[PDB]
């Protein structure tokens, strides 16, 4: 037969990796693939139990979305030792030389258009600031909210560096930005001591936020403290992933955008990844540069991000499938 392919994927708390899961199983099993899909509720140690069996059941490719890729260098090695592949899924693992192809959207891109839906909206380029910001970023597990970080700030910097821009709390970077976890609990803790000790005075007319659910916990955070009224307005506050909730409060003129990154669509380069491996052939990558992950650059394929605000969620999310209508209502 075809063989198998374990797809390891990390939680079913932040929405999308559901339908990454769903997708990837879809796609391959069309192609004529059998599946072991695992979910690992965030626990590491139970994501790499997972790994192992899938190496012990011999599975032809590893397909891993992990919590803390450098928890897996042993599995890795030991799935090599075994021939076989391992496609890095989403996030890149990072401290193994094990690892053989990496599909993503392009991460850097991702931070470059969240800054960007920021200082369009506050008119920076009309000159218009200064604008009081504070930054969130990802998990520092993570590898990619340092690239959302990253493409953000290089969009950023240079108006905190003008002060057109100006960081209240003094925060940045990402020993000091980062979120555990993803944790919208923890960011909405953070921004309430944000408030707190920065903002009792002035207010915040931005905040940028590396993904939905951090950015619904800060937008309650806000709330708590009178932001989202008429009188005074949410700061404008970015996202990722296009979750439900997210895209309801951005059409309620609450959150103001979100990023749009189409799983369907990694799935897809995925699979193709899988037929090449399977085939004997070299796997389509566009990226050979940027992935160093500690022991090498990981050859990579990016796909291209789509960012949504309350102007084109009709045209970007349902008209092209990803939800229904009354999804959203
Ligand atoms: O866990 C999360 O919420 C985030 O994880 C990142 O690695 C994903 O690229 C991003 O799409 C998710 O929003």
């Given amino acids: 037969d075809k063989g198998s392919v374990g797809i390891a994927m990390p939680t079913k708390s932040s929405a999308r990796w559901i339908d990454d899961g769903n997708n990837i199983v879809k796609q391959l099993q069309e192609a004529g693939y059998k599946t072991d899909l695992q979910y690992a509720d965030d626990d590491i140690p139970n994501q790499l ?3 192992e069996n899938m190496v012990t059941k011999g599975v032809k490719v590893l397909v891993i979305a992990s919590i803390d890729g450098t928890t897996l260098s042993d599995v890795l090695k030991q799935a090599g030792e075994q021939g076989i592949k391992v496609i890095a899924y989403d996030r890149l693992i990072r401290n193994s030389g094990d690892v053989s192809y990496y599909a993503t959207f392009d991460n850097f891109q991702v931070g470059v258009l969240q800054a960007t839906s920021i200082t369009d909206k506050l008119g920076l380029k009309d000159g218009k600031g200064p604008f009081n910001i504070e930054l969130f970023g990802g998990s520092p597990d993570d590898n990619n909210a340092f690239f959302f ?21 003094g925060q940045m970077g990402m020993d000091k930005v980062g979120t555990l976890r993803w944790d919208p609990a923890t960011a909405q803790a953070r921004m309430d001591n944000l408030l707190s000790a920065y903002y009792t005075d002035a207010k915040v007319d931005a905040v940028l936020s590396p993904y939905d659910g951090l950015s619904i916990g800060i937008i309650s955070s806000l709330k708590g403290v009178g932001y989202g009224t008429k009188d005074q307005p949410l700061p404008v506050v970015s996202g ?35 037929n090449a491996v399977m085939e ?3 796997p389509e990558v566009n990226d050979t540069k940027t992935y160093e992950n500690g022991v090498k650059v990981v050859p990579s394929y990016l796909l291209k991000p789509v960012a949504v605000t309350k102007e084109n969620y009709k045209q970007v999310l349902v008209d092209g499938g990803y939800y229904k209508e009354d999804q959203l209502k």
């Fill in 280 to 282: 004997g052939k070299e």
């Fill in 240 to 274: 990722q992933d296009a979750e439900v909730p997210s895209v309801k409060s951005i059409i309620a003129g609450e959150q103001y955008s979100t990023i749009f990154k189409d799983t369907r669509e990694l799935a897809k380069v995925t699979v193709n990844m899988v």
């Fill in 49 to 51: 139990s997972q790994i």
């Fill in 149 to 169: 970080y990253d493409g953000a700030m290089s969009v950023l910097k240079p108006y905190i560096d003008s002060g057109k821009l100006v960081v209240k709390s």
